[PDB]
XYZ file of C-alpha atoms in Angstrom:
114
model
C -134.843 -25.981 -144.265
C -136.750 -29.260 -144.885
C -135.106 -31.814 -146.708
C -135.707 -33.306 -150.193
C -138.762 -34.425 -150.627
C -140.842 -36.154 -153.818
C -142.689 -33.350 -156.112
C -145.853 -35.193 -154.703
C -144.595 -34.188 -151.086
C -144.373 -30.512 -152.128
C -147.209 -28.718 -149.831
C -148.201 -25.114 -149.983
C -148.453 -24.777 -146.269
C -144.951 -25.704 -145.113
C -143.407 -22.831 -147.709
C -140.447 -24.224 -147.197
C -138.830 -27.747 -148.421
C -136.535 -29.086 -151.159
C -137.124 -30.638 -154.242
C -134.207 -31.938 -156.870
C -135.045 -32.460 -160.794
C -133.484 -31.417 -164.139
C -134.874 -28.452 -166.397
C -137.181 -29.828 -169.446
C -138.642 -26.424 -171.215
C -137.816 -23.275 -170.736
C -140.648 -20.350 -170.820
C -139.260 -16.651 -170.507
C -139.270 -13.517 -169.188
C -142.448 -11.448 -169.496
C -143.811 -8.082 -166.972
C -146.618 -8.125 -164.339
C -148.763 -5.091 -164.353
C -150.028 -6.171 -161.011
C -153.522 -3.995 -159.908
C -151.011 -1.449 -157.488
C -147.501 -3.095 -158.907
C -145.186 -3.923 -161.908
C -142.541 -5.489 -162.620
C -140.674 -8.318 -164.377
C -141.331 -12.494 -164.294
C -140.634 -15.521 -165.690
C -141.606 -19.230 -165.942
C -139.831 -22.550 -166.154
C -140.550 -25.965 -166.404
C -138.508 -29.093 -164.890
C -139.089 -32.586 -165.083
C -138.192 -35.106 -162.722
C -138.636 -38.864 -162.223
C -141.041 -38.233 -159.481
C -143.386 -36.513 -161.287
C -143.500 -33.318 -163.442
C -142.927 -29.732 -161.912
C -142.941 -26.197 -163.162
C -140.648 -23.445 -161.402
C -141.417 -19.665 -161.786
C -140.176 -16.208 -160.451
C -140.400 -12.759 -160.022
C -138.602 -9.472 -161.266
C -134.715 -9.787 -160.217
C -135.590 -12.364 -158.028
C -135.587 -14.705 -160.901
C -133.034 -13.232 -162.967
C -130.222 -14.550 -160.191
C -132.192 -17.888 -159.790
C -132.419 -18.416 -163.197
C -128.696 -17.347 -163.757
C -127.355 -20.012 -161.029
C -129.769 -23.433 -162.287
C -128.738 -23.955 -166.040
C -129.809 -25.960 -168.729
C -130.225 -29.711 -169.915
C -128.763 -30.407 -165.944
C -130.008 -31.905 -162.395
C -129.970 -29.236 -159.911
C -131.770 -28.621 -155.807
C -134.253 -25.764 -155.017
C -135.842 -24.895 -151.919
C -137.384 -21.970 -149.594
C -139.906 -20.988 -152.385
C -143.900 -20.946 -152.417
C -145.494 -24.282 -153.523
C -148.573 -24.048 -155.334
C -150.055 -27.163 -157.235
C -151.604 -26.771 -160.426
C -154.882 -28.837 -161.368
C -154.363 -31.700 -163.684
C -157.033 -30.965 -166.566
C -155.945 -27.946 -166.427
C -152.532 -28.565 -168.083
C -152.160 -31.247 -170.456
C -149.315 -32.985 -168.255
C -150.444 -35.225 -165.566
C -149.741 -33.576 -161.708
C -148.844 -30.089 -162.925
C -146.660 -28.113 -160.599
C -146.480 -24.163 -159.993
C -143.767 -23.140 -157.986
C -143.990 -18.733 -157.738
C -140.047 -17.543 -156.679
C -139.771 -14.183 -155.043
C -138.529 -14.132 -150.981
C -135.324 -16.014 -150.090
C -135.264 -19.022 -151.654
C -131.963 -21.314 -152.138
C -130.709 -22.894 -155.473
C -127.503 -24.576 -156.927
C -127.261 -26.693 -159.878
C -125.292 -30.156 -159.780
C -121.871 -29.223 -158.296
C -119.012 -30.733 -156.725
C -119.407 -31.045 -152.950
C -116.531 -32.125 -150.731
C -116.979 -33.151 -147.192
C-alpha cells in the first residue's frame, strides 16, 4: 500500500498508491456491453489542489465505493488502476482516469484516533 502521493505521481504501472482530494462533479451510473461481458459502471470526477482527477468503477464494485466517499467532502483512495487521460482530449488541463474494479480501499474524511 503506497502512500499518498500528488495526482501527478499517480503511475499506471505501480497499480497501487494513494491519492486524497474532494469530489467536484458527479457523472452516473450507466451498463457496459463489453464484446463477451455486461454489466453496470459509473464515473466520477474529483478535484484536488494538486491537480484535477477523475475516479470511475465497475458494476457493484462501484456501487460500495461510491456508497462509502460522499459528496461536497475530502476523502483517501487507493489500490485502484491509474490511467492518465490526454490533455486536449478533455477540456481540463492533466485529465485523470482512474477505472475501479479489484480490491481497492476508500474512506471519506473521518475521525481517526491513535
Amino acid at each position: 500500500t503506497r502512500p499518498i502521493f500528488a495526482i501527478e505521481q499517480l503511475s499506471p504501472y505501480q497499480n497501487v498508491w494513494t491519492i486524497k482530494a474532494r469530489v467536484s462533479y458527479k457523472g452516473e451510473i450507466k451498463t457496459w456491453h463489453n464484446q463477451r461481458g455486461d454489466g453496470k459502471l459509473f464515473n466520477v470526477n474529483f478535484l484536488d489542489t494538486s491537480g484535477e482527477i477523475r475516479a470511475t468503477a465497475f458494476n457493484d464494485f462501484a456501487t460500495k465505493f461510491n456508497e462509502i466517499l460522499q459528496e461536497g467532502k475530502v476523502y483517501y483512495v487507493s489500490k485502484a488502476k491509474l490511467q492518465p487521460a490526454k490533455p486536449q482530449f478533455t477540456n481540463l488541463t492533466h485529465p485523470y482516469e482512474l477505472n475501479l474494479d479489484r480490491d481497492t480501499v476508500i474512506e471519506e474524511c473521518f475521525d481517526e484516533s491513535n
